[PDB]
Design a protein around this ligand. Structure first.
Ligand SMILES: Nc1nc2c(ncn2[C@@H]2O[C@H](COP(=O)(O)OP(=O)(O)O)[C@@H](O)[C@H]2O)c(=O)[nH]1
Ligand SMILES: [Mg+2]
Lengths: 258, 16
């Protein structure tokens, strides 16, 4: 095989899983044998289209912030708080909205200070909530606001009591967009499990963090391929509020291929 | 020097 040896090479460098890698060459080979001739130049194009077709449709990516309540939950240290700040900063400064915070992360030390200092900078109010009732109450106070950004404590969501804890603290009944936050630095086999545990909770979008920190995006692709939802944001550094961005399925696949 | 440096600068400017 000629350029297909090259396509085989690309797929190698992305961290995609073997099954997938293979099945992509199948589709690739199939198409090209039975339909015209592909150059060493034009392979990549076709390759990317094929991969992209395995990801959720674009209308399921880059969902904008509309709902009143914006919740991020996810793994420990993944960057939830930092990302919440960025998101909020955008809502106030760029989009000129009345914003407020709730935090639920009573567990980790200084997590409240952390969000507090952001809320102070942004001159927005902040409620700590230990219970759904307190949360429901907080809702009353913030009824005049446009957006309430809600932070939560990172847990080992492999163990499902924390899924329970979470569900028993957040009212998903509400006008609410919920983002599952995972680190681009995480192992696929790990994320796979997390996403299973989150099955019983209404996640709207993924957020992938620290894409500036990992060598390959294959792991993230692998997750997205087995998912019915797309990615709302990706983060690429520690700086607030600059280091956030959005992507389309194609835009994502381009990143995948270096 | 602070991961929030930029944001801080933006808020200072708003104030102005
Ligand atoms: N390189 C990099 N670091 C990040 C990113 N997002 C967050 N961090 C850092 O990860 C560390 C912990 O983040 P934090 O928001 O406290 O995680 P949380 O427990 O999920 O809320 C902090 O140093 C953040 O500045 C990112 O996109 N890239
Ligand atoms: Mg946090």
């Amino acid at each position: 095989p000629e350029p297909l040896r090259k396509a085989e090479k690309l797929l190698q460098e992305t961290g995609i899983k073997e099954s997938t890698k293979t099945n992509t060459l199948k589709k690739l080979l199939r198409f090209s044998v039975e339909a015209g001739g592909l150059t060493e130049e034009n392979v990549v194009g076709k390759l990317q289209e094929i991969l992209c077709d395995m990801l959720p449709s674009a209308d399921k990516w880059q969902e904008p912030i509309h709902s009143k309540y914006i919740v991020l939950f996810g793994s420990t240290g993944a960057g939830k708080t930092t990302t919440l700040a960025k998101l909020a900063a955008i809502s106030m400064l760029e989009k000129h909205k009345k914003i407020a915070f709730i935090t639920t992360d009573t567990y980790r030390i200084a997590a409240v200070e952390q969000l507090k200092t952001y809320a102070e900078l942004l001159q927005a109010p902040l409620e700590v909530c230990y219970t759904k009732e307190e949360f429901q109450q907080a809702k009353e106070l913030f009824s005049e606001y446009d957006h309430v950004f809600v932070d939560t404590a990172g847990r080992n969501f492999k163990d499902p009591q924390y899924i329970d804890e979470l569900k028993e603290t957040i009212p998903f009944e509400s006008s609410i967009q919920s983002f599952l936050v995972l680190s681009a630095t995480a192992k696929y086999e790990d994320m796979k499990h997390i996403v299973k545990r989150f099955s019983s909770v209404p996640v709207n979008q993924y957020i992938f963090t620290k894409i500036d920190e990992t060598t390959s995006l294959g792991s993230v692709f692998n997750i997205l391929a087995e998912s019915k939802i797309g990615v709302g944001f990706m983060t690429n550094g520690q700086n607030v509020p600059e280091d956030i961005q959005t992507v389309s399925p194609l835009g994502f696949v381009r990143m995948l291929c270096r | 020097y602070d991961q929030a440096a930029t944001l801080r600068a933006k808020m200072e400017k708003r104030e102005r």
